[PDB]
Design a protein around this nucleic acid. Structure first.
Lengths: 134, 50, 147, 52, 86, 122
RNA sequence: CGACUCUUAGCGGUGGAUCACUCGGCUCGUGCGUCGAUGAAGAACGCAGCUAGCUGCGAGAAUUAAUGUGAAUUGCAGGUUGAUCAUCGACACUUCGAACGCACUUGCGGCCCCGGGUUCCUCCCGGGGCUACGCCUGUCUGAGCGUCGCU
RNA sequence: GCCGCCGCAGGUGCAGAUCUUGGUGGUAGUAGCAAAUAUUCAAACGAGAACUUUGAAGGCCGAAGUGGAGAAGGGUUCCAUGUGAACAGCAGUUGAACAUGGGUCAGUCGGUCCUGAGAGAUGGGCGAGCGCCGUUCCGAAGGGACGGGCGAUGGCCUCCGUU
RNA sequence: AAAUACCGGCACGAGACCGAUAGUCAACAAGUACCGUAAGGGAAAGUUGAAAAGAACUUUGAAGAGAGAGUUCAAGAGGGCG
RNA sequence: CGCGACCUCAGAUCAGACGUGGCGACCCGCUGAAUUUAAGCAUAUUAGUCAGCGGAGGAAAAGAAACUAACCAGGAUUCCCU
């Protein structure tokens, strides 16, 4: 159970905290998992998706083994666009099609100065919590 | 009237500025709702008071 | 639109209901000290006759015995993996396993007022000093602890 | 004012004025007609600023 | 003659814009407002019409000094200081 | 050359106003364009140049109003802009002093009769 | 034979019940308990590249700084030395309104000091600062065949 | 998304109340588009002419006008470029509709500036109270001037505004 | 000072309640469209789909209206569309 | 006639500080109905309630007795049970 009586177990509010939200904490409701050799490496499991991260789809018509690549993150609509994940519209000219990022998996991280800062903080609270209770 | 106050002229000027139809890129957006406008005023039917 | 057009009347569109509801209804009741007392001895003796406990569905056909008792080393278990292994020893896991099945969606408005997933009652456990026993069971559905 | 306006057309394009008539439109802004001097020229200064 | 012939003798106004409530209801000959009594030092309002008061109280308009008292309140009316630099 | 406001602060008081009055002519031609003819590189630029000025007008004041409130820092009377200010009926409250005060008799009654510490036994 | 008249069924019209969904109400509880001459609540007019309404904001006008967040906003075009987003502590807020020079026609004044006609030289066109009632503490100028005083 | 068995709980069963709200019939392609004399022939724009546009005929208003210009009141309806959905009780090429784009310049023509019947502050007085009565009536209600004189400005304190 | 009161305000947590003729007048540009000289009076109005993939090309027509192509699991879901 | 002290009373854009107005759900001070009950109705009832006017606060107001008693005496004020 949630015990703390300043948190709600209420449908209607929860969806109104979700569907009237901001353009900043929408970076980590749209986060997505690392692959099976970036769980083994950094000590980081999920992560916020970004601009030039590489990715597989895993669910829908468009799944399978192709490491494509993200072109844009359309926060206002809870969905990313990916390189060759696209389709042909009624005048010939192809569109993009969007994928929510539960249904995706990262395959190359954009590694900046400030991105490595979320990677090496999350390899402390996983490792104090593991060490303190073992 | 042709003669007027500075004040009343200013009043009738706010209203023209208003009464003219929507620009339709306002219903090309994301989540939008507005079909057209029904606040549009026409001088033979309704009257402004004043 | 609204004009010359029905106003107060349990018949009217808009317009009051018949005998509006009041907070100062009698929401509670009381009982004697010795009928809330009379009715525990009754709920205790019928949870023994073992032909009664079956008819509350429970999954007892393999339970060693009785009204079941245990050494005082169950009061201090904080782990559920100890308390699950423990529930399989005494041969009553099958009642939890009836509880895992029993989980489902409900019928009705119930839903839109957040009483959504419903499910069965299981075994329930009675103890003298909570030394950790609440932590070890409290995640396994269907279990009440009870001092 | 008229008096105010007449120095603002004077002290930014450099140019001396004859007279500055005004009125106020049904949309509600002030529109000043600015006569100019004979030694000065009107199509010529108009190019400098951009209105052609 | 009482009806519709005399409805055609109209070319004049009793009221106009008040300049406080702003409400076309300021009676020229008598010179106070019908809604607020403008010359009067306080307001007009009343306890026999309540749907009258709740067109028009502190929630209604902008609140433009007030909506930032409430916000300024809850830490401890902090004045003068500024947050630590970089 | 984007005007980043950190490095507009140390410079000298006058030198700004030259730079203010070039963003008031690096604008003015953008309301002739829009009116005459086209050009989005003219049209969207408008809304930088607004900001670029309101960046300059703020620095100017910040620092000036600073000058004053350090040119009245110890003084007893001082202008109405530059005083203690939060809430009206908080202004009128009594002072830190006027709520300390002890008369000699209460200084004397609290002297001999302050409150003890003790414990009953069982 | 045929039209028409009535019944029933199939498929179509017309209409928006019923069912299923819900970022909205209703009721109970807890906690704090903050408006104003330093210009409130309320009004009015203004502010977007494309923009009328709700929103948010004031000639610094969908906002400026700073602290935090760390790569958007998006309906189309154009534009990492910190985008966009929350925090709000430094800066700023048209005209009315208890509303304050006099008056409600957006009309007539008085007092000083500043830049221009200047070479204060009044009048002239601009820019700034004071010009409401009531009342308390004390300071200045005074009135009284009120009560006394000494030449 | 839902239902049976044992128990609980209630804003729990419609033909009707000239009952409430919404929708649809017969009557019915029926009543009807009748007040103030009147039209017709040719062309040219067009996918469409009894009605719009030009030209010719015959007519009415008849200067107490179906003529020319204003004040209240309306608030852009003024003017050109288009459109043919809806509206303008047959029709539209038309329109005071719709959509886009223009249009109201003053010392000498008004308001301001003075009073009229009348509206109304202060002194006073009435009042539990917001407030009311009263307007010359129980008020120390004039803040200005040409000169006489003391001592201070400005431009050669010469001569005068300025205290 | 405390033990008391709190259908206005600022934040919060629940419900053997109501579910769009209900529930607040207000689920939506509501104290908004509109009416009254003025005091005041005051509505109606939720739902394509998983995604716009919102039907290129042809053909009759002056135009709305159509015939065939086509997207979708479906148009027997075609922009007031369960 | 002058000079000086007091008392009672003018005027200032004199130096520095205060009041007005708002919201009003709970609190304090005033003023104050009739429908309706009596099977009619005038006293009674509604009710010191509705509407009116005034002043506040985070609570207000009350408050350490010109107090209850009739006892083998309780010992400011508010609040619940009785």
């Amino acid at each position: 159970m949630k015990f703390n009586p300043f948190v709600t177990s209420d449908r209607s509010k929860n969806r109104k905290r979700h569907f009237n939200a901001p353009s900043h904490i929408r970076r980590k409701i749209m986060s997505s998992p690392l692959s099976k050799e970036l769980r083994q490496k950094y000590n980081v499991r999920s992560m916020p998706i970004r601009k030039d991260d590489e990715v597989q789809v895993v669910r829908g018509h468009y799944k399978g083994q192709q490491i494509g690549k993200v072109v844009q993150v359309y926060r206002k609509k809870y969905v990313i666009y990916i390189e060759r994940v696209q389709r042909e519209k009624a005048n010939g000219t192809t569109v993009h099609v969007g994928i929510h990022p539960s249904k995706v998996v990262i395959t190359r991280l954009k590694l900046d100065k400030d991105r490595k800062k979320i990677l090496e903080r999350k390899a402390k609270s996983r490792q104090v919590g593991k060490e303190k209770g073992k | 009237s042709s003669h007027k106050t500075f004040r009343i002229k200013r009043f009738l000027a706010k209203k023209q500025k208003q009464n003219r139809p929507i620009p339709q890129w306002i219903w090309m957006k994301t989540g939008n709702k507005i079909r057209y406008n029904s606040k549009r005023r026409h001088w033979r039917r309704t009257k402004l008071g004043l | 639109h609204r004009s010359g057009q029905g106003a107060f009347g349990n018949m009217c569109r808009g317009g009051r209901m018949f005998a509006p509801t009041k907070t100062w209804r009698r929401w509670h009741r009381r009982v004697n000290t010795t009928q809330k007392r009379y009715a525990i001895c009754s709920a205790l003796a019928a949870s023994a006759l073992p032909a009664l406990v079956m008819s509350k569905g429970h999954r007892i056909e393999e339970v060693p015995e009785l009204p079941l008792v245990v050494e005082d080393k169950v009061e201090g278990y904080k782990k559920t993996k100890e308390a699950v292994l423990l529930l399989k020893k005494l041969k009553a896991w099958n009642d939890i396993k009836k509880v895992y099945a029993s989980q489902r969606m409900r019928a009705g408005k119930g839903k839109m007022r957040n009483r959504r997933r419903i499910q069965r009652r299981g075994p329930c456990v009675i103890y003298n000093e909570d030394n950790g026993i609440v932590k070890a069971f409290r995640n396994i559905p269907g279990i009440t602890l009870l001092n | 004012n008229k008096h105010q306006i007449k120095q603002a057309v004077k002290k930014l394009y450099d140019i001396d004025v004859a007279k500055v008539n005004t009125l106020i439109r049904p949309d509600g802004e002030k529109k000043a007609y600015v006569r100019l001097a004979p030694d000065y020229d009107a199509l010529d200064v108009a190019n400098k600023i951009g209105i052609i | 003659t009482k009806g519709t012939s005399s409805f055609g003798k109209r070319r004049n106004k009793t009221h106009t814009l008040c300049r406080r409530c702003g409400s076309k209801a300021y009676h020229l000959q008598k010179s106070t407002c019908g809604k607020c009594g403008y010359p009067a030092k306080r307001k007009r309002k009343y306890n026999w019409s309540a749907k009258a008061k709740r067109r028009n109280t502190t929630g209604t308009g902008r609140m433009r000094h007030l909506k930032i008292v409430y916000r300024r309140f809850r830490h401890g009316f902090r004045e003068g200081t500024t947050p630590k630099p970089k | 050359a984007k005007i980043k406001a950190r490095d507009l602060r140390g410079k000298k008081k006058e030198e700004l106003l030259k730079q203010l009055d070039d963003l008031k002519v690096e604008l003015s031609q953008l309301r002739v364009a829009k009116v005459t003819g086209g050009a989005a590189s003219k049209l969207s630029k408008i809304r930088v140049v607004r900001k670029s000025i309101a960046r300059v007008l703020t620095v100017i004041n910040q620092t000036q109003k600073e000058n004053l409130r350090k040119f009245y820092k110890g003084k007893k009377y001082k202008p109405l802009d530059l005083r203690p200010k939060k809430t009206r009926a908080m202004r009128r409250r009594l002072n830190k002093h006027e709520e300390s005060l002890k008369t000699k008799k209460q200084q004397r009654k609290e002297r001999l009769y302050p409150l003890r510490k003790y414990a009953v036994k069982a």
